[model samples]
Target: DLGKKLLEAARAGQDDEVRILMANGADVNAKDRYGNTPLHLAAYMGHLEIVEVLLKYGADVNAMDHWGRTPLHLAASRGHLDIVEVLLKHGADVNAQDKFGKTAFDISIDNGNEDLAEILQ
Candidate 1:
């Protein structure tokens, strides 16, 4: 339930609520059922502000989920260029791989996100 609430807040772009939650001691690195942290959801949903906030709170940029997919992987896979850029700037591993033994570049290519693929590479 807490995971769901965190995911919801990240997905809804609730920057204030997210900040409040963090200030109130919410786990910034909390993972959902899929092992996705709020940072992961923010990256997947292209919530730049939330992503920045999470990163500032020390969320692991290279934190892998249940599937071993990092926030960078999801951002690239979803064609979220800005989010991808931000993650990269925050020191995310460009070559991080998933459980499928695929890198972010691989997912971008498989998803037909050529631009993102290029960026990942």
Candidate 2:
């Protein structure tokens, strides 16, 4: 489906293709099988431009996938500082907990990312 294609484009960091898809009526908030929208994939992959574009298209910054992980959670866990900052600026819940009751900052600390933890704090 077009949703799958959009997700693929986002994961691959194809911003131009993403824009084309959106202009062609692709649902910017389309969620995959796991409830992950393009924003989720973009954040997980540290694609800042894609993340911003998706946000502009009304992607829910606080949306949680099947794992209860928001884009902020993914950005924090992976140490994507820019993405984290962007998500936060967009009003992502900084203290949102995952399925395991761990916040994004918690995951950052658990992964031994002290720098990220400090920045999050």
Candidate 3:
């Protein structure tokens, strides 16, 4: 499937594949069985260019996976501040909560990423 391939290519950090897939008409917001969007993968993996391209192609910044974790949640959990900033700028809910009711800021502090927590706050 082009959608799955696009997601896989994005996860592998193949920027050219991502570009070609999107340019050739892959669903920019393609998600997995667990609801992990390509944006979610890009954020979780800290791929800024992939993320930017996904966003440019109209991906949902606030999309939540099966655990109700958005791109912000994944980025913050990994302390990917740059991705977090991009998500925020794209209108990610800084106050969004996971299935456990823990917000991105909560995950940051819990993981002791003060740098992430401070910025998320």
Candidate 4:
């Protein structure tokens, strides 16, 4: 299915496959059983180009997973600084709180990512 394929391609950092899938009408916003969107997979994996493509295709930058974690949270938790920057640029809610009431900024702080914490502040 294009849905799972989208997640796989994005996770694998295959931007070319991402483009092909999206061009063929893949659901960029499709969620897995865990409620994770393609954007979450791409951003968490640090696939910058795939992240851009997913955003261009209208992937919700603020879409949440089962735990209420957004792409910003995933990227920040993994310390994918550049991916986090790109997500922010795409209008991801700067202070979006998850189920635990923790925002991406909070994740950065807990991870000891002071550089990202500063920017997120």
Candidate 5:
């Protein structure tokens, strides 16, 4: 399926593949079995370009996975500062909490990424 391909492309940082898939009508917001969208994989995998492409294709910036964690949650938790910045620029919810009631800021601090925490502030 295009959605599955799009998810894999974003996860692997296949920039061109992501573009192609999206152009071919892949669901930008399609969730996997875990309820994670292309944005979530892109953010968590630190794929800055893929993240931008997905967002450009109308991916949900604040999409929550099964755990109720948004793309910002994934990016901040993984210390992907650039990805986090892009997500924020796209209006990603900064204060959206996860299943554990932790926001992106809390996740950044928990991950010991002071730089990320500073920006998330």
Candidate 6:
């Protein structure tokens, strides 16, 4: 299924495959069993290009997963600074709290990513 393939491609950082899957009409917002969209995986995996492609294909920048963690939370948790910047540029909500009531800013601080923390602030 294009949905599964797009998720895989995004996680693997296969920019070409991601673009192909999206061009082929894959649901850019497709979620996994955990409610994680392709944008979630792309940001969490630190795949900058994949994140951009997913956004271009209309992936929801602020879509939350089962735990209410948005792509911004994932990117900040992993210290993916550039991906965080891109997500913010695309309107990711810094104030969105997860199931634990922690925002991406909190995650950045927890991870000791001062650079990300500063940007998130």
Against the reference, the lDDT scores of all candidates come to 0.87, 0.89, 0.92, 0.92, 0.92, 0.92
| RMSD for each of the candidates | 1.5, 1.1, 0.7, 0.8, 0.6, 0.6
lDDT of 6 by residue, 14-50 (tens): 9998988888999999989999899999999999999
Residue 109, model 1: lDDT of 88
Q: For every model shown, what is its TM-score relative to the native structure?
A: 0.91, 0.94, 0.97, 0.97, 0.98, 0.98
Candidate 5 C-alpha lDDT tens digits along 25-60? 999999899999999999999999998888887988
Candidate 5: residue 12 lDDT (0-100): 91
* C-alpha lDDT of candidate 5 relative to the true structure: 0.92
Candidate 3: give its CA RMSD in angstroms.
Answer: 0.7
Which ten-residue region of model 1 has the weakest summed lDDT?
Answer: 1-10
Candidate 4 worst ten-residue window by lDDT:
43-52
Model 4 stretches astray by more than 4 angstroms: none
Candidate 3, residue 114: the lDDT equals 97
Candidate 1: stretches off by over 4 Å:
1-4
> What's the true lDDT of residue 64 in model 6?
95
Q: How accurate is candidate 6 locally (lDDT)?
A: 0.92
Superposition TM-score, candidate 6 onto the true structure: 0.98
Instruction: Name the better of 4 and 5 by TM-score.
Output: 5
Q: Candidate 3, which segments miss by more than 4 Å at Cα?
A: none
Error of 3 at 101 (Å): 0.3
